[PDB]
Amino acid sequence: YFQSMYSIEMGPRGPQWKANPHPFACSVEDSYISYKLTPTHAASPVYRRYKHFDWLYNRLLHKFTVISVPHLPEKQDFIEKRKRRLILWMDHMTSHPVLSQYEGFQHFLSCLDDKQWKMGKRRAEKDEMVGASFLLTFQIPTEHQDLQDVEDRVDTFKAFSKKMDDSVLQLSTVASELVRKHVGGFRKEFQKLGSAFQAISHSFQMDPPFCSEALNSAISHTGRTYEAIGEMFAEQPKNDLFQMLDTLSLYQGLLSNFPDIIHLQKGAFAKVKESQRMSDEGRMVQDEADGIRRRCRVVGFALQAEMNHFHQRRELDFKHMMQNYLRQQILFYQRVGQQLEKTLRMYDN
Amino acid sequence: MYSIEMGPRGPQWKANPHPFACSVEDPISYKLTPTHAASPVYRRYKHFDWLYNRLLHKFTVISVPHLPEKQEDFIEKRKRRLILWMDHMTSHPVLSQYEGFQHFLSCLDDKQWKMGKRRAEKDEMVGASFLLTFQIPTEHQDLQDVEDRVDTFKAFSKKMDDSVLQLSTVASELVRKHVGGFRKEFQKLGSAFQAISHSFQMDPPFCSEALNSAISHTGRTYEAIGEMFAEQPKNDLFQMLDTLSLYQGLLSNFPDIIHLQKGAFAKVKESQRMSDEGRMVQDEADGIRRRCRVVGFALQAEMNHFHQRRELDFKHMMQNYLRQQILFYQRVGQQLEKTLRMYDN
């Protein structure tokens, strides 16, 4: 036809991406690993390798200037961690109103024949560098008429994204330390205690007619119990901390896109003030300076729609992150207590 | 007044005909309320120390519970360890019937207090003279069998002294971990949660205060859990250390007593060997064997009683510790559940 046109609509939070009219989701599952991808809109599953993921990712970066594109996991439990984060990546892709409609993404998810695969790759390599469309569905209010008010919005988001990048990094660092603290210090303390309870028991077995075999076994049971709890601490991060880190990792990449995204838009804001001022001196034509203004305005709404979409996904993802972490901790400490109440019952006899 | 009788586990102290208990309260003067006394009695630590030094001079073959140190949690831990000391005293068949101990509990006067004090000072029967107080069994046990029993207890007491020291060391380290390490990690986690929430408040119209409040609630929760860990040793670890301290004092009483017994067995074989060679009068060699038989009975009774209390106190120790650990991790789980509902719905 002509070109794809992404729409920006007004909403409760202000400018937002109009939803994908043809929504879908995609599951990721299983010396070359070919991940089995099953999108909702396809009749047959699709097998793609990280190499193919990396191809698409590079295509996305060159295509979308104002949109934050989710980062892939490292190129180099690495295998398991990769799949968890490819899933998180995929979900963020499918739930993004613009990224989910990208033709290169569609070719990535639908193409079966390998002969058509090569063609569809080169076909997506000539678009981009075509930048964007961004039609605006609503009518421009009197509040958004000043690009100054829009630029002030961008500045507050920059400062926000800076401290969020700090808090996320700090939390991700703390979590990774807890993992080692769980495999190390936590396990060690419970195992020194259990080893001590075993030492007490062994000493109590050195006088056969004057010692109770029941008590000596109970204390010995508590010894093995605490030594088993130590192993529970060591095996716990895989249930709660790992998934939290995966979530934080997703937002490391999203937040890392913003510095450049914001830099571009502030450059457009300066180009507007420059073009207009130059048009006031007489060294610039007015209608050309008008085109700069109106274009900067439209992509300003796009950015506003993206920051809006970021907050929307953030609130969903962080809610589920805290919930999932706490539910597991609750389970973990419940399991701990049951071990203790199991070994306490040994002393009833 | 004292007697040693045979039993299922062998030689043992005859039970106190008039058993009792004594509560210790802190209204420094301690409020002591003997259950068999008509009126409560107030005593300071110096009074305990006086009584303690009387027991050392009096009962040589008996293992006397050590008094807590004379020189934070100090002065509070003394109250706990004086209770354990008192309980061991009133539950000992010999020590509980001691006249000076009864004077220490049932003297509500003051002039009579100084009098009874002197009464215990100039006691004719002490040490080796105390051995003529209690009567032994009429049964005859092989002297070699007794020595083997003592030697078995010697090996046991040494290994237990180590295992107790091991657990005592581990527990003391656990107290510091609770105040330091365990608290710190929770404090770090909640602090990070706090920062996340704070950073979420930097873009006011676009961020949910409901979510930020829940996140910062979880932060204050994990910080609260940190302080719970810091306060926890007072509920379980402190009590366990008090029990181990009690038995470290008891196990230290034995080496000297055992050594005296080993010397008693030695002089029996010694005197008899030379009595046969005509180097000593047999009647005097008999008096040595007789003396060894008596002290051997007293030691077996003490070793039996030590085991009797050991299995009780350690059963209760392990029970009290576990029960408090259980309650602790339940209270933690409640803190976590309380903060999870903040994310509803």
Coordinates of N, CA, C and O in Angstrom, one line a residue, chain A residues 93-188:
Chain A
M93 N 7.4 -7.2 24.0 CA 7.2 -6.9 22.5 C 5.8 -7.0 22.1 O 5.3 -6.1 21.4
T94 N 5.1 -8.1 22.5 CA 3.7 -8.4 22.1 C 2.8 -7.4 22.7 O 1.7 -7.1 22.1
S95 N 3.1 -6.9 23.9 CA 2.2 -6.0 24.6 C 2.5 -4.5 24.3 O 1.8 -3.6 24.8
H96 N 3.4 -4.3 23.4 CA 3.7 -2.9 22.9 C 2.9 -2.6 21.7 O 3.1 -3.3 20.7
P97 N 2.0 -1.6 21.7 CA 1.1 -1.3 20.6 C 1.8 -1.0 19.3 O 1.2 -1.3 18.2
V98 N 3.1 -0.5 19.3 CA 3.8 -0.2 18.1 C 4.8 -1.3 17.7 O 4.8 -1.7 16.5
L99 N 5.5 -1.8 18.6 CA 6.5 -2.9 18.4 C 5.9 -4.2 17.9 O 6.5 -4.9 17.1
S100 N 4.7 -4.4 18.3 CA 4.0 -5.7 17.9 C 3.5 -5.6 16.5 O 3.2 -6.6 15.9
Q101 N 3.4 -4.4 15.9 CA 2.9 -4.2 14.6 C 4.1 -4.1 13.5 O 3.8 -4.0 12.3
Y102 N 5.3 -4.2 14.0 CA 6.5 -4.0 13.2 C 6.6 -5.2 12.2 O 6.5 -6.4 12.6
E103 N 6.7 -4.9 10.9 CA 6.7 -6.0 9.9 C 7.8 -7.0 10.1 O 7.7 -8.2 9.8
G104 N 9.0 -6.5 10.5 CA 10.1 -7.3 10.8 C 9.9 -8.3 11.9 O 10.4 -9.4 11.9
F105 N 9.0 -7.9 12.8 CA 8.6 -8.8 13.9 C 7.6 -9.8 13.4 O 7.7 -11.0 13.8
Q106 N 6.7 -9.4 12.5 CA 5.8 -10.3 11.9 C 6.4 -11.4 11.1 O 6.1 -12.6 11.2
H107 N 7.4 -11.0 10.3 CA 8.2 -11.9 9.5 C 9.0 -12.9 10.4 O 9.2 -14.1 10.0
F108 N 9.4 -12.4 11.5 CA 10.1 -13.2 12.5 C 9.3 -14.3 13.1 O 9.7 -15.4 13.5
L109 N 8.0 -14.0 13.2 CA 7.0 -14.9 13.9 C 6.2 -15.8 13.0 O 5.6 -16.8 13.5
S110 N 6.1 -15.4 11.8 CA 5.2 -16.1 10.9 C 5.8 -17.0 9.8 O 5.3 -18.0 9.3
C111 N 7.0 -16.6 9.4 CA 7.7 -17.2 8.2 C 8.1 -18.7 8.5 O 8.7 -19.0 9.5
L112 N 7.6 -19.5 7.6 CA 7.9 -20.9 7.6 C 9.0 -21.3 6.6 O 10.1 -21.8 7.0
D113 N 8.7 -21.2 5.4 CA 9.6 -21.5 4.3 C 11.0 -20.7 4.4 O 11.0 -19.5 4.7
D114 N 12.1 -21.4 4.3 CA 13.4 -20.8 4.5 C 13.8 -19.9 3.3 O 14.5 -19.0 3.4
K115 N 13.2 -20.2 2.1 CA 13.4 -19.4 0.9 C 12.9 -18.0 1.1 O 13.4 -17.0 0.7
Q116 N 11.7 -18.0 1.8 CA 11.0 -16.7 2.0 C 11.7 -16.0 3.2 O 11.5 -14.8 3.4
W117 N 12.4 -16.7 4.0 CA 13.1 -16.2 5.2 C 14.2 -15.2 4.8 O 14.2 -14.1 5.4
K118 N 15.0 -15.6 3.9 CA 16.1 -14.7 3.4 C 15.5 -13.4 2.8 O 16.1 -12.3 3.1
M119 N 14.5 -13.6 2.0 CA 13.9 -12.4 1.3 C 13.3 -11.4 2.3 O 13.5 -10.2 2.2
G120 N 12.6 -12.0 3.3 CA 11.9 -11.2 4.3 C 12.9 -10.4 5.2 O 12.6 -9.4 5.8
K121 N 14.1 -11.0 5.3 CA 15.2 -10.3 6.1 C 15.7 -9.1 5.4 O 15.7 -8.0 6.0
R122 N 16.1 -9.2 4.1 CA 16.5 -8.1 3.3 C 15.4 -7.1 3.1 O 15.7 -5.9 3.0
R123 N 14.2 -7.6 3.0 CA 13.0 -6.7 2.8 C 12.8 -5.8 4.0 O 12.4 -4.7 3.9
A124 N 13.2 -6.3 5.2 CA 13.1 -5.5 6.4 C 14.3 -4.6 6.7 O 14.4 -3.8 7.6
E125 N 15.4 -4.8 5.8 CA 16.6 -4.1 6.0 C 16.6 -2.8 5.2 O 17.5 -2.0 5.3
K126 N 15.6 -2.6 4.3 CA 15.5 -1.4 3.6 C 14.4 -0.5 4.2 O 14.3 0.7 3.8
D127 N 13.7 -1.0 5.2 CA 12.8 -0.2 6.0 C 12.9 -0.9 7.4 O 12.3 -1.9 7.6
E128 N 13.8 -0.3 8.3 CA 14.3 1.0 8.2 C 15.4 1.1 7.1 O 15.8 0.1 6.6
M129 N 16.0 2.3 6.8 CA 16.0 3.6 7.6 C 14.8 4.5 7.6 O 14.8 5.6 8.2
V130 N 13.7 4.1 6.9 CA 12.4 4.9 7.0 C 12.0 5.0 8.5 O 11.8 4.0 9.2
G131 N 11.9 6.2 9.0 CA 11.8 6.4 10.4 C 10.5 6.1 11.1 O 10.5 5.2 12.0
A132 N 9.3 6.6 10.7 CA 8.1 6.5 11.4 C 6.9 7.1 10.7 O 7.0 7.5 9.5
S133 N 5.7 7.1 11.4 CA 4.5 7.7 10.8 C 3.9 8.7 11.8 O 3.9 9.9 11.7
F134 N 3.3 8.1 12.9 CA 2.7 8.8 14.0 C 1.6 9.8 13.6 O 1.8 11.0 13.6
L135 N 0.4 9.2 13.2 CA -0.8 10.1 13.0 C -1.4 10.3 14.4 O -1.2 9.6 15.3
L136 N -2.1 11.5 14.5 CA -2.7 11.8 15.8 C -4.2 11.9 15.7 O -4.8 12.6 14.9
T137 N -4.8 11.0 16.5 CA -6.3 10.8 16.4 C -7.1 11.9 16.9 O -8.1 12.3 16.3
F138 N -6.7 12.5 18.0 CA -7.5 13.5 18.7 C -7.2 14.9 18.1 O -6.5 15.0 17.1
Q139 N -7.7 15.9 18.8 CA -7.5 17.3 18.4 C -6.6 17.9 19.5 O -6.8 17.8 20.7
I140 N -5.5 18.7 19.0 CA -4.5 19.2 19.9 C -5.1 20.3 20.9 O -5.7 21.3 20.4
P141 N -5.1 20.0 22.2 CA -5.6 20.9 23.2 C -4.9 22.2 23.3 O -3.9 22.4 22.6
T142 N -5.3 23.1 24.2 CA -4.6 24.3 24.4 C -3.5 24.2 25.4 O -2.6 25.1 25.5
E143 N -3.4 23.0 26.1 CA -2.4 22.7 27.1 C -1.1 22.3 26.4 O 0.0 22.5 26.9
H144 N -1.3 21.6 25.3 CA -0.1 21.0 24.5 C 0.4 22.0 23.4 O 1.3 21.6 22.7
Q145 N -0.2 23.1 23.3 CA 0.2 24.1 22.3 C 1.6 24.6 22.5 O 2.3 24.8 21.6
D146 N 1.9 24.8 23.8 CA 3.3 25.2 24.2 C 4.2 24.0 24.2 O 4.0 23.1 25.0
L147 N 5.2 24.0 23.4 CA 6.2 22.9 23.4 C 7.1 23.0 24.6 O 7.8 22.1 25.0
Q148 N 7.0 24.2 25.3 CA 7.8 24.4 26.5 C 7.2 23.5 27.6 O 7.9 22.9 28.4
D149 N 5.9 23.4 27.7 CA 5.2 22.6 28.7 C 5.5 21.1 28.4 O 5.6 20.3 29.3
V150 N 5.7 20.8 27.1 CA 6.0 19.4 26.8 C 7.5 19.1 27.1 O 7.8 18.0 27.6
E151 N 8.3 20.0 26.9 CA 9.8 19.9 27.2 C 10.0 19.8 28.7 O 10.9 19.1 29.2
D152 N 9.2 20.5 29.5 CA 9.2 20.4 31.0 C 8.8 19.1 31.4 O 9.3 18.6 32.5
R153 N 7.9 18.4 30.7 CA 7.4 17.1 31.0 C 8.6 16.1 30.8 O 8.8 15.2 31.6
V154 N 9.3 16.3 29.7 CA 10.4 15.4 29.3 C 11.5 15.5 30.3 O 12.2 14.5 30.7
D155 N 11.8 16.7 30.8 CA 12.8 16.9 31.8 C 12.6 16.2 33.1 O 13.5 15.6 33.7
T156 N 11.3 16.2 33.6 CA 10.9 15.6 34.8 C 11.0 14.0 34.7 O 11.3 13.3 35.6
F157 N 10.8 13.6 33.4 CA 10.9 12.1 33.2 C 12.4 11.7 33.1 O 12.7 10.6 33.5
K158 N 13.2 12.6 32.6 CA 14.7 12.3 32.6 C 15.2 12.1 34.0 O 15.9 11.1 34.3
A159 N 14.9 13.1 34.9 CA 15.4 13.0 36.2 C 14.8 11.8 36.9 O 15.5 11.1 37.7
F160 N 13.5 11.5 36.6 CA 12.9 10.3 37.2 C 13.6 9.0 36.7 O 13.9 8.1 37.6
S161 N 13.9 8.9 35.4 CA 14.5 7.7 34.9 C 15.9 7.5 35.4 O 16.4 6.4 35.4
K162 N 16.6 8.6 35.8 CA 17.9 8.6 36.3 C 17.9 7.9 37.7 O 18.7 7.0 38.0
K163 N 17.0 8.3 38.6 CA 16.9 7.8 39.9 C 16.3 6.4 39.9 O 16.6 5.6 40.8
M164 N 15.4 6.1 39.0 CA 14.9 4.7 38.8 C 16.0 3.8 38.3 O 16.0 2.7 38.8
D165 N 16.8 4.3 37.5 CA 18.0 3.5 37.0 C 18.9 3.2 38.1 O 19.6 2.2 38.2
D166 N 19.0 4.1 39.1 CA 19.8 3.9 40.3 C 19.2 2.9 41.2 O 19.9 2.0 41.6
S167 N 17.9 3.1 41.5 CA 17.2 2.2 42.5 C 17.1 0.8 41.9 O 17.2 -0.2 42.7
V168 N 16.9 0.6 40.6 CA 16.8 -0.7 40.0 C 18.2 -1.4 40.1 O 18.3 -2.5 40.4
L169 N 19.2 -0.6 39.7 CA 20.6 -1.2 39.8 C 21.0 -1.5 41.2 O 21.6 -2.6 41.4
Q170 N 20.6 -0.7 42.2 CA 21.0 -1.0 43.6 C 20.2 -2.2 44.1 O 20.8 -3.0 44.8
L171 N 18.9 -2.3 43.7 CA 18.1 -3.5 44.1 C 18.7 -4.7 43.4 O 18.7 -5.8 44.0
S172 N 19.0 -4.6 42.1 CA 19.6 -5.8 41.4 C 20.9 -6.2 42.0 O 21.2 -7.4 41.9
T173 N 21.7 -5.3 42.5 CA 22.9 -5.6 43.1 C 22.7 -6.3 44.5 O 23.4 -7.2 44.8
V174 N 21.8 -5.8 45.2 CA 21.4 -6.4 46.5 C 20.9 -7.8 46.4 O 21.3 -8.7 47.1
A175 N 20.0 -8.0 45.4 CA 19.5 -9.3 45.1 C 20.6 -10.3 44.8 O 20.6 -11.5 45.3
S176 N 21.5 -9.9 43.9 CA 22.6 -10.8 43.5 C 23.5 -11.1 44.7 O 24.1 -12.2 44.7
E177 N 23.6 -10.2 45.6 CA 24.4 -10.4 46.8 C 23.7 -11.4 47.8 O 24.3 -12.3 48.4
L178 N 22.4 -11.3 47.8 CA 21.6 -12.2 48.6 C 21.7 -13.6 48.1 O 21.7 -14.6 48.9
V179 N 21.8 -13.8 46.8 CA 22.0 -15.1 46.2 C 23.2 -15.8 46.7 O 23.2 -16.9 47.1
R180 N 24.4 -15.1 46.7 CA 25.6 -15.6 47.3 C 25.5 -15.7 48.8 O 26.1 -16.7 49.3
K181 N 24.8 -14.9 49.4 CA 24.6 -14.9 50.9 C 23.8 -16.1 51.3 O 23.9 -16.7 52.3
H182 N 22.9 -16.5 50.4 CA 22.0 -17.7 50.6 C 22.8 -19.0 50.4 O 22.6 -19.9 51.1
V183 N 23.6 -19.0 49.3 CA 24.4 -20.2 49.0 C 25.6 -20.3 50.0 O 26.1 -21.4 50.2
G184 N 26.0 -19.2 50.6 CA 27.1 -19.1 51.5 C 26.8 -19.0 53.0 O 26.6 -20.0 53.7
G185 N 26.7 -17.7 53.4 CA 26.6 -17.4 54.8 C 25.3 -18.0 55.5 O 25.5 -18.6 56.6
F186 N 24.2 -17.9 54.8 CA 22.9 -18.4 55.4 C 23.0 -19.9 55.6 O 22.7 -20.4 56.7
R187 N 23.4 -20.6 54.6 CA 23.6 -22.1 54.7 C 24.6 -22.5 55.8 O 24.4 -23.4 56.5
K188 N 25.7 -21.7 55.8 CA 26.8 -22.0 56.8 C 26.3 -21.9 58.2 O 26.7 -22.8 59.0

